[PDB]
Design a protein around this ligand. Structure first.
Ligand SMILES: Nc1ncnc2c1ncn2[C@@H]1O[C@H](COP(=O)(O)OP(=O)(O)O)[C@@H](O)[C@H]1O
Ligand SMILES: Nc1ncnc2c1ncn2[C@@H]1O[C@H](COP(=O)(O)OP(=O)(O)O)[C@@H](O)[C@H]1O
Ligand SMILES: Nc1ncnc2c1ncn2[C@@H]1O[C@H](COP(=O)(O)OP(=O)(O)O)[C@@H](O)[C@H]1O
Lengths: 686, 289
């Protein structure tokens, strides 16, 4: 029998082997409704990895055994085909075909009405279960991209399925899932889980673990924290460790001192016995309280496990009409058990760091820090603290755009405090000359909000200038130009919801593409090429332009404000400009502002020198710093030429002199203005 | 929409005339909104969209500032094969095919090229238009709203009936009499009074109050009378009407109200009192830092 490749999900439901399903009621109704059709009655779940496609099928198994299904599905055996163990457990040989025909024909013959679930069904499309006589009912699962690239390219097979879009849960929806799962993961690892950790896991998974989708990214995070405390609780506390070792040390010293015959040894041998006794007097109360209390936390955890097992037997008794055994458990066994837990737990808090058996926000922040590589100190700081000094944090990166930094900071504060439309993402149009900070501010925002430059995604509107390019942005219907690649924007929103979308040189976008941005800015959601609406409530929109550099001379001025804004009113329609949260204007950088930018860059070069072994300190004379700022600025490219200019004039020679030994450890690399050209001079002749 | 009772009654009566079957079934309801900027012309059209179709997307906006020259007509209806914008089609004709039950808003209609106006008259008179390739597209089930401000000169803050034909004679030279005659209702917006401007302020804090309630926060915004007065005085403009009001509240009240909330100086269950201190609107903390 080819039960080697399938697991009975309906069986697992009767045995309490399926963790609870939270929410997702409308999706399970859709699956039931599709299955009950006679038309195309095979649902295919379409969603990103980890959004909960499988647990939807698991909920259906729970509904089949609980009679919460229509009659046509009540006596169904819902089987899950292990396609992973099928294609990987096989080679090019004819065993893939032979193995699947075997299972497909065991389904054929036996007389249970059987619904086959195949997760990652695209792996079966590179095979032919055309048993659509009404022999088998199938539930498929895959991602949207793989549905497009592998399932959508065999229409005849596809048309017998009906899409069910499974969107990613909100953070709020995610904690409801984690809260509902809380007790299962408590009893499983034998530890306790605080609610603030659950809120921490959901909020942090969405913000920093952008590589995996909710709620899986939050589930994996709590599960790893719990496993990290499963070993902490089975280890002696730190103070019992330290005490026990000094005690063993003093016992060594006592045996040794008792051998030496002299006046000073005997006076401290007696002191060593006392020090040993003092340690033992501090250690015995503690070591006793620890074991006393780890033995009870373990007695509680099995008390919880027999309770759960009783409820499985009780649910199955009442399901099978055995009222005799169902009365045993529901009225006597289970409340006798529940009374044992109530008493053992009540004394637990009453007994009363030590015995770490709790998943707290610290354990979540530490687990994430190891995975994400961000220092734990940066994850403990409250969002409210950062946002209150946001202008401070950005101004360390962006010079001379105080009016811009204030606008970005105020808009973000408006949304975490709940005063902005919750269906509209913050939207920005940066306007001003090249090399003034428009892109840089957006990078600083990315690293401030998500502590990662990757959190921003860049779209260059120079590549979306014609009406033909819209399919590149959102995708295309089947059989069209770029149906399979999808859209750049739509695919970015599905896989990186908490992102900053930078649209560079937005003035060049085709009017059809601008229309998509207005939908993004107004409704917080867009429609892809196939009518599907993808969500975007949790992104940030930054658009950059330079249509105002004509009226900005190096000097911010308020009369110049509407000459650039009237230049904007003809390129963009008034409804476009009205739906932008803040139209922000960058002015040209002054000579002093250009000079601090130079100090910023030497500070970074100074950091790499310090980050490596070298104790070389870069100091810049005033007039040399002045020539760098004069050679660096350009009325056309702003501060862009500055990074390369320093490299060419200062850094090239500074390298050579370091490796030549003409600037040694502990000395200063003095960069001067000699004969009107910036140079850095040696400190020792060759 | 505050302070445009004569306008709301006109829109309401015209719609009632057509669901009850007393208006021409081949003519869509057509409106020309006339009056100063920021008086409610666009807003009333949005409210109509959300009232009739419970969706702001049910309206489609055409800015006549982008149809000022005779060349622009092909943008409106399309072009014969091989011409300028044959493939993009027309904005109006493509909108009517794909969104028949729509509200078509033509903003600043006074600036449309006379050829484009001709298309609107066909839309208003026959309920159908001809695209660039002679094809006739149907439009029996749409609504036409046109906005203008050619009458703001003769409307001081006070609606008055002698002022009615000074704005309507200003309309008679920009638009031909057959154009004006085929419009279901020529509706005039007057300037908003000081009390009307004040309820608009209460409307906007009510929306900010809703988002606060819609999120977790039990912070209640109350506005003193004189602070509410300064907001309405700083907000109104004889040129931009009530447009500066939304940003003014954001700049003076909402920016600080955010900071104080995240600082904990206005906590759950308390009131954000917005006052007039030293002649400038501010919202004060309830607890020192
Ligand atoms: N509605 C839900 N209720 C409880 N747990 C859920 C829910 N949705 C997802 N999960 C959890 O998320 C994790 C991965 O979900 P899963 O259904 O395997 O995602 P997918 O199958 O879409 O890759 C599982 O550990 C599961 O327990
Ligand atoms: N205001 C500024 N503060 C600091 N550096 C700046 C500033 N403006 C420009 N730069 C430098 O110039 C480079 C490019 O600037 P950027 O902001 O990308 O120009 P744009 O305004 O065209 O987006 C950045 O890497 C940065 O080093
Ligand atoms: N009568 C009014 N009632 C309420 N709000 C108004 C009124 N008039 C103007 N506003 C405010 O001003 C903004 C712009 O008004 P709008 O009606 O677009 O001006 P216009 O008359 O130029 O179309 C609206 O978003 C609205 O908040």
């Amino acid at each position: 029998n080819l039960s080697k490749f399938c697991i009975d999900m309906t069986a697992m439901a009767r045995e309490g082997k399926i963790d609870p399903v939270i929410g997702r009621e409308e999706e399970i109704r859709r699956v039931i409704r599709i299955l009950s059709r006679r038309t195309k009655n095979n649902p295919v779940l379409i969603g990103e990895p980890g959004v909960g496609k499988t647990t939807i099928v698991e909920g259906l198994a729970q509904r089949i055994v609980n009679a919460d299904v229509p009659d046509n599905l009540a006596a169904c055996k819902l089987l899950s085909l292990d396609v992973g163990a099928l294609v990987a457990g096989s080679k090019y040989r004819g065993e893939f075909e032979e193995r699947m025909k075997g299972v497909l024909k065991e389904i054929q013959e036996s007389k249970e009405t059987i619904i086959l679930f195949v997760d990652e069904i695209h792996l079966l499309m590179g095979l032919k279960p055309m048993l659509a006589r009404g022999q088998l009912h199938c539930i498929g699962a895959t991602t949207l991209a793989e549905y497009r690239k592998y399932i959508e390219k065999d229409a005849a097979f596809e048309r017998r399925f009906q899409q069910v879009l499974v969107k990613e849960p909100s953070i709020t929806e995610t904690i409801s899932i984690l809260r509902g799962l809380k007790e299962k993961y408590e009893v499983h690892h034998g530890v306790n889980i605080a609610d603030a950790a659950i809120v921490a896991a959901a909020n942090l998974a969405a913000r920093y673990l952008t590589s995996r989708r909710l709620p899986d990214s939050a589930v994996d995070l709590i599960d790893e924290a719990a496993a990290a405390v499963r070993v902490a609780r089975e280890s002696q506390p730190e103070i019992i460790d330290s005490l026990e070792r000094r005690l063993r040390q003093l016992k060594i010293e006592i045996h040794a001192l008792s051998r030496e015959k002299d006046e000073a040894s005997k006076a401290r041998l007696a002191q060593a016995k006392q020090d040993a006794q003092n340690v033992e007097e501090e250690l015995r109360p503690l070591r006793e309280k620890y074991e006393r209390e780890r033995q009870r936390g373990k007695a509680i955890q099995e008390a919880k496990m027999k309770l759960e097992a009783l409820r499985v037997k009780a649910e199955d008794a009442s399901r099978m009409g055995d009222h005799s055994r169902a009365a045993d458990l529901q009225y006597y066994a289970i409340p006798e058990q529940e009374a044992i837990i109530k008493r053992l737990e009540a004394e637990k808090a009453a007994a009363d760091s030590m015995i770490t058996d709790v998943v707290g926000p610290d354990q979540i922040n530490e687990i994430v820090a190891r995975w994400t590589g961000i220092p734990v100190t940066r994850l403990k700081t409250s969002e409210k603290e950062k946002l209150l000094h946001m202008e401070q944090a950005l101004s360390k990166i962006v010079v001379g755009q105080k009016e811009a930094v204030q606008s970005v900071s105020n808009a973000i504060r408006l949304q975490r405090s709940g005063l902005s439309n919750p269906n509209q993402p913050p939207s920005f149009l940066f306007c001003g000359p090249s090399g003034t900070g428009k892109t840089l501010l957006t990078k600083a925002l990315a690293e401030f909000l998500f502590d990662d430059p990757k959190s921003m995604i860049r779209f260059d509107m120079s590549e979306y200038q014609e009406r033909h390019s819209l399919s590149r942005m959102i995708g295309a219907p089947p059989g069209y130009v770029g149906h399979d690649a999808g859209g750049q924007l739509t695919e970015a929103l599905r896989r990186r919801p908490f992102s900053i979308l930078l649209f560079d040189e937005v003035e060049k976008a085709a009017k059809e593409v601008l229309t998509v941005l207005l939908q993004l800015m107004d409704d917080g959601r867009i429609t892809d090429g196939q009518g599907r609406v993808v969500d975007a409530k949790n992104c940030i929109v930054v658009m950059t332009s330079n249509l105002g550099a004509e009226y900005l001379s190096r000097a911010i001025d308020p009369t110049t404000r509407e000459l650039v804004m009237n230049t904007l009113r003809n390129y963009f329609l008034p409804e476009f400009l009205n739906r932008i949260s803040s139209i922000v204007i960058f002015n040209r950088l002054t000579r002093r502002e250009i000079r601090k930018i130079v100090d910023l860059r030497i500070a970074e070069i100074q950091k790499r020198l310090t980050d490596n072994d070298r104790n070389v300190t870069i100091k810049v004379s005033d007039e040399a710093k002045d020539k760098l700022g004069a050679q660096g600025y350009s009325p056309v490219y702003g501060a862009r030429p500055l990074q390369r200019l320093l490299e060419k004039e200062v850094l090239n020679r500074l390298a050579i002199l370091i490796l030549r030994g003409q600037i040694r450890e502990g000395e200063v690399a003095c960069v001067e203005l000699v004969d009107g050209k910036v140079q850095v001079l040696p400190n020792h002749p060759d």
